Ligand binder design. Structure first.
Ligand SMILES: N[C@@H](Cc1ccc(OP(=O)(O)O)cc1)C(=O)O
Ligand SMILES: N[C@@H](Cc1ccc(OP(=O)(O)O)cc1)C(=O)O
Ligand SMILES: [Mg+2]
Length: 298
């Protein structure tokens, strides 16, 4: 099982080598659409692009490109859309995607400003009375309510297709203390947050895939999805030992490049899954422990 493997890798001090082996074995598929000259201003990073086979296509006749990938986990029966933090000119495309893909939740794992630089546009309204209208995609977005915790905030937003007047409730789960190329403060804080997303019903198969993003949509995003899928896998079978975490990560990498950006994020993923397995296997009390340990109260 992964716990024994975690021990071997830890004692050997080989997280860097294990992680590097994953980078070496990772899939390489073309990203020709992402690289078209007309799409230059739709990519936040030159080196992070969606593969053509798994990219999400916007349903507009103009230009259907958005730096977003559909991670379809067949065995686990869960899909996620991993995307970069929207740019000033792609906020309308972002919400168009949320609408068209029928997503119920948006998981944001970064902050708008990190390390003195703008890593993501302010794509949602910060005040109820100042709603946002994305003219290019004909969508209106209104902040309905906000529940601010110590290291994450949950928001209820109302997305409206101005063309048809149909409205939908979108839940925003914002993890505010996870530095890029870094790991969460503890497996507890992370699991507490993941469980809040799960409890909301945003990951349910009755909804479109949850949209997960960070700045690039691969590091922190990849860590979140890897832990969730691994937990879901062992949950379906109620068998912790049936999950090969490296293999699951490689499977995800068939859909988007660079998922999990550092060896420590991989190590953290193992920790999160191993700890989460306690809940999956019947000890529901650990959830309350995580809530305590996370110190979510201000
Ligand atoms: N390598 C580039 C792009 C990059 C940025 C962030 C990143 O992680 P995340 O997906 O967690 O935002 C991954 C890659 C950079 O370091 O700026
Ligand atoms: N951090 C990289 C993003 C990235 C990293 C790795 C990657 O694939 P691989 O790990 O196999 O090299 C793909 C994309 C960059 O922005 O330069
Ligand atoms: Mg106010």
């Amino acid at each position: 099982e992964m716990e024994k493997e975690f021990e071997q890798i830890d004692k050997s001090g080989s997280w860097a080598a294990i992680y590097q082996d994953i980078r070496h074995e990772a899939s390489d598929f073309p990203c020709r659409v992402a690289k078209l000259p007309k799409n230059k201003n739709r990519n936040r990073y030159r080196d992070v692009s969606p593969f053509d086979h798994s990219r999400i296509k916007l349903h507009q006749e103009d230009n259907d490109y958005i730096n977003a990938s559909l991670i379809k986990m067949e065995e686990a029966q869960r899909s996620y859309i991993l995307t970069q933090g929207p740019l000033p000119n792609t906020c309308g495309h972002f919400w168009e995607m949320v609408w068209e893909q029928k997503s119920r939740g948006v998981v944001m794992l970064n902050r708008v400003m990190e390390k003195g630089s703008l890593k993501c546009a302010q794509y949602w309204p910060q005040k109820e009375e100042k709603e946002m209208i994305f003219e290019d995609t004909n969508l209106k977005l209104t902040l309905i309510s906000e529940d601010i915790k110590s290291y994450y905030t949950v928001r209820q937003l109302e997305l409206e297709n101005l063309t048809t007047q149909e409205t939908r409730e979108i839940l925003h789960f914002h993890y505010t203390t996870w530095p890029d190329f870094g790991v969460p403060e503890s497996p507890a804080s992370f699991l507490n947050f993941l469980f809040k997303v799960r409890e909301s019903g945003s990951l349910s198969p009755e909804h479109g895939p949850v949209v997960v993003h960070s700045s690039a949509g691969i590091g922190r995003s990849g860590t979140f999805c890897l832990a969730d899928t691994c937990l879901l896998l062992m949950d379906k079978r109620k068998d912790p030992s049936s999950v090969d975490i490296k293999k699951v990560l490689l499977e995800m990498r068939k859909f988007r490049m660079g998922l999990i950006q550092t060896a420590d994020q991989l190590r953290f993923s193992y920790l999160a899954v191993i700890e989460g397995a306690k809940f999956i296997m019947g000890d529901s009390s650990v959830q309350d422990q995580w809530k305590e340990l996370s110190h979510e109260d201000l």
